[PDB]
Amino acid sequence: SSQNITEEFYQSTCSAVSRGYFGALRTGWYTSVITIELSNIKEIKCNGTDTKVKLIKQELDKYKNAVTDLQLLMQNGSAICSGIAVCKVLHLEGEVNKIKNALLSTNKAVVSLSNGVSVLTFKVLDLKNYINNRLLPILNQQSCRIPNIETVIEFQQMNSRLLEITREFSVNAGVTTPLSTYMLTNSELLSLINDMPITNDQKKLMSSNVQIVRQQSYSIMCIIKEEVLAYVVQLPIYGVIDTPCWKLHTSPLCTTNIKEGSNICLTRTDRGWYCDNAGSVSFFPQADTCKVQSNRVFCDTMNSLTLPSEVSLCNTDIFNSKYDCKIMTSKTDISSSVITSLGAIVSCYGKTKCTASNKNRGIIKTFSNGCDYVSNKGVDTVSVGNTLYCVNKLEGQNLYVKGEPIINYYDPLVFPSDEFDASISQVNEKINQSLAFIRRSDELLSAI
């Protein structure tokens, strides 16, 4: 998969749209139950004064405090409804019994719930076995004896994972995200990936990049009873694979040169990644939804604003009647440089001076009063105002698709629609009603 990213900068709306990114949208979750076999050990009647026995004593006290804290949290979006439903189903009496029966001899098993859902199961940690077989026997009677420092060190190391799990759940109040390493190890995550009910393409894609999956997954709390701590991990699946996806970097373009004192501007409301889903283009407004890795983007349809297929008409012709666009219309003149994948827009405006830069050639270009565009070839740093923005070092088929600014068509007598964030047709309605205001004002004056 060669990284053939082709960005095309536009001078019409001064929005640069990348291309060549093969995305992978997520349409659902896969809830699996992960159980830690806790042990409810009563306060031992040990009166030893040795350092090792004492250390085992505060470690057991820490374990008991962690268990009590877990019970304390157990007392009280689609991001968590599947896990919540699984927890509620597992709260039914007998489901824990079936889970333990299935996992009696195997660390992995498939259990069918009462309502019909079949969930994969794991046994990441075995604290009950280790405790009842090592700590309880020797440290049982009135005489206390622990002669192995290896034993206490091993107990510290193993109980550490439970301690971090309790800490993360306490701070995050029962639901954690992203899936930390402590909750599910990389090897265990890979093993669960291999057992997923999907084809080999999705399995290979989700195996290649595992940190992305960790970022997009979740973790819940269900129940601590019958000496079992079960937390459901909501790993995702990707129904659509390698769909053509494109970023839509935008930048505020302000008036022709700079009219001294005040004037308009029109940046493009919609930014972030776009993707094609079953003939309808998906849209992601938030930056934290879609994550980039190499030449392929990973997204999340949790709050994706599904759009029709005519979205691509916005880029090539903003004033197309086949599709409806949108542009935030403001009045603030700030020089900015939206860094893109294979370039950098620069809206040098007003008094501030902006110049391209190179480490070896020094300053090689000087901007003007317009949203100009600078390629990544021959440029490594862009200096705008008082700050310096690094220009990506990636190589791609850059295309300066120039045109004319859309500002010139707007009426120069007045520039209405201050601080507006609606569709372009609505902005046409706004300019229409503002010039209706002005025509009725002047006709009333003439009638007077």
């Epitope: 409810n40 009563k42 009496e93 007998g94 824990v96 019994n97 079936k98 333990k100 029966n101 299935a102 009696l104 069918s112 009462s114 009873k225 019958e226 000496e227």
Partner: antibody, heavy 116, light 107 residues
């Protein structure tokens, strides 16, 4: 090493109340729930229902609704069944059970006899 | 409710017989079946955790197999210390139903 101990046998008359108690020792009583079973004389084994040893909300099988009720005292680690409005069909044995790695685990039986 | 019945209601075998007991279910249960060994005038105990996992402390002669609706035990060799009434009971969901009782005897 988990031992469940029940009460003793009784011989009484219809219309009165029977108190049969099971005490659980060997584990913390909060988590594991208490389950009650019926044995008819010579027939198979019925299933009453369950009483949760954490909150105290029981659920009853449709056959055994109306006359039977279990209550528990978590402080004493004992759960007892009160059987009011005794019928002649009450003859049989009573069992207290819990979920131990799959199937149930029942303690010793308590013969109940109904005279006239 | 899932009703469970046993075909050999009354069984009588010799000391060296390989006896077989089957249980049926009205519905489909993924394993979730166990048996009990009722001694006369005592409290029965389990011997097979699931359809194919024998319990600890049970002689290896006992063992089981089957999934879905048909389930069946396997006894390698009868031993006179083993005698009583055998029942089978699922734990798929409440309510909980037992069988008719396999009253094994000695020929």
């Amino acid at each position: 090493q988990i031992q469940l101990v029940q009460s003793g046998p009784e011989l009484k008359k219809p219309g009165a109340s029977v108190k049969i108690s099971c005490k659980a020792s060997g584990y913390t009583f909060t988590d594991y729930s208490m389950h009650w079973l019926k044995q008819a004389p010579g027939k198979g084994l019925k299933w009453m229902g369950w009483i949760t040893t954490e909150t105290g909300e029981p659920t009853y099988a449709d056959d055994f609704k109306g006359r039977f009720a279990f209550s528990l005292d978590t402080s004493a680690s004992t759960a007892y069944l009160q059987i009011s409005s005794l019928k002649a069909e009450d003859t049989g044995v009573y069992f207290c059970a819990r979920y131990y790695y799959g199937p149930f685990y029942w303690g010793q039986g308590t013969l109940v006899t109904v005279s006239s | 409710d899932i009703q469970m019945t046993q075909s050999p209601s009354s069984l009588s075998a010799s000391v060296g017989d390989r006896v077989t007991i089957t249980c049926r279910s009205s519905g489909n249960i993924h394993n979730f079946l166990t048996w009990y060994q009722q001694k006369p005038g005592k409290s029965p105990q389990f011997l097979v955790y699931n359809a194919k996992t024998l319990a600890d402390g049970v002689p290896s002669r006992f063992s089981g197999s089957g999934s879905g609706t048909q389930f069946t035990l396997t006894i390698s060799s009868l031993q006179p210390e083993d005698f009583g009434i055998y029942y089978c009971q699922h734990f798929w969901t409440t309510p909980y139903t037992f069988g008719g009782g396999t009253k094994v005897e000695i020929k």
